[PDB]
Design an enzyme around this catalytic site. Structure first.
Site, PDB file in Angstrom:
ATOM      1  N   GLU A  11     -16.454  -5.251   7.164  1.00  0.00           N
ATOM      2  CA  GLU A  11     -15.830  -4.010   7.642  1.00  0.00           C
ATOM      3  C   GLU A  11     -16.806  -2.851   7.844  1.00  0.00           C
ATOM      4  OE1 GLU A  11     -12.946  -3.969   8.851  1.00  0.00           O
ATOM      5  OE2 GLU A  11     -11.824  -5.600   7.910  1.00  0.00           O
ATOM      6  N   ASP A  20     -11.471   1.054  15.243  1.00  0.00           N
ATOM      7  CA  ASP A  20     -11.746  -0.322  14.831  1.00  0.00           C
ATOM      8  C   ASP A  20     -11.901  -1.236  16.062  1.00  0.00           C
ATOM      9  OD1 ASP A  20      -9.170  -1.093  15.704  1.00  0.00           O
ATOM     10  OD2 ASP A  20      -8.373  -1.386  13.686  1.00  0.00           O
ATOM     11  N   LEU A  32      -7.395   1.115   8.030  1.00  0.00           N
ATOM     12  CA  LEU A  32      -6.603   1.459   9.208  1.00  0.00           C
ATOM     13  C   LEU A  32      -5.737   2.691   8.927  1.00  0.00           C
ATOM     14  CD1 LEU A  32      -5.586   0.852  12.090  1.00  0.00           C
ATOM     15  CD2 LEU A  32      -3.882  -0.675  11.067  1.00  0.00           C
ATOM     16  N   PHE A 104      -6.303  -8.671   4.829  1.00  0.00           N
ATOM     17  CA  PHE A 104      -6.913  -7.349   4.993  1.00  0.00           C
ATOM     18  C   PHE A 104      -7.051  -6.976   6.484  1.00  0.00           C
ATOM     19  CE2 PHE A 104      -9.251  -3.990   2.670  1.00  0.00           C
ATOM     20  CZ  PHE A 104      -9.946  -3.348   3.707  1.00  0.00           C
ATOM     21  N   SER A 117      -2.439 -23.872   9.976  1.00  0.00           N
ATOM     22  CA  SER A 117      -3.682 -23.678   9.225  1.00  0.00           C
ATOM     23  C   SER A 117      -3.397 -23.657   7.727  1.00  0.00           C
ATOM     24  CB  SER A 117      -4.359 -22.368   9.626  1.00  0.00           C
ATOM     25  OG  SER A 117      -5.003 -22.476  10.883  1.00  0.00           O
ATOM     26  N   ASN A 132      -8.521 -25.784  13.168  1.00  0.00           N
ATOM     27  CA  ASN A 132      -7.265 -25.109  13.486  1.00  0.00           C
ATOM     28  C   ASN A 132      -7.355 -23.574  13.447  1.00  0.00           C
ATOM     29  OD1 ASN A 132      -4.210 -24.176  12.557  1.00  0.00           O
ATOM     30  ND2 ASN A 132      -4.256 -25.810  14.094  1.00  0.00           N
TER      31      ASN A 132
END
Length: 164
Positions: A11, A20, A32, A104, A117, A132
């Site tokens: 990040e 972002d 965010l 996150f 998945s 996947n």
């Protein structure tokens, strides 16, 4: 290496409001603020989060405070989700970090499309899960980060982060 150091790598750290990867107003370590195109709306969300009139700038300590809260909220959210919790519980600690990483970035709603998945992850079919996971908007839009996260799921090691 741990979830905090891992997300710090993925990040970054920026102390002024920035956009972002999706064009959304953000601050600190990928906190965010809002999906709204209004900078003023973002500044309001920021003030609310920090508890003071910031005018778009925060300290490292404040950035780290929000970050800890966000990581906590991500984990808590996984455990409160009836679909996510069993998969999470099934994983070792390294792969659990990879799970928190995705939540996150994407939120639980982002992870909703990852049913197949998640099944493969619970089955511990690591190579198949990895294949996947890459078949996603997520991988296509953020391939370098996705590749790190996927390697973490595939190997159960920090190899994708050790060098960074």
């Amino acid at each position: 290496m741990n979830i905090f150091e891992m997300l710090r790598i993925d990040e970054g750290l920026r102390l002024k409001i920035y956009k972002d990867t999706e064009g959304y107003y953000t601050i600190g370590i990928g906190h965010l603020l809002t999906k709204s195109p209004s900078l003023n709306a973002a500044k309001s969300e920021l003030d609310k989060a920090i508890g003071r009139n910031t005018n778009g700038v925060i300290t490292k300590d404040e950035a780290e405070k929000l970050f800890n809260q966000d990581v906590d909220a991500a984990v808590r959210g996984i455990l409160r989700n009836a679909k996510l919790k069993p998969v999470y519980d099934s994983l070792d600690a390294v792969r659990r970090a990879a799970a928190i990483n995705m939540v996150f970035q994407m939120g639980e709603t982002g992870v909703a499309g990852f049913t197949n998945s998640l099944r493969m992850l619970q089955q511990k079919r690591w190579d198949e899960a990895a294949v996947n996971l890459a078949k996603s908007r997520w991988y296509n839009q953020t391939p370098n980060r996705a590749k790190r996260v996927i390697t973490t799921f595939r190997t159960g090691t920090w190899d994708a982060y050790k060098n960074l």
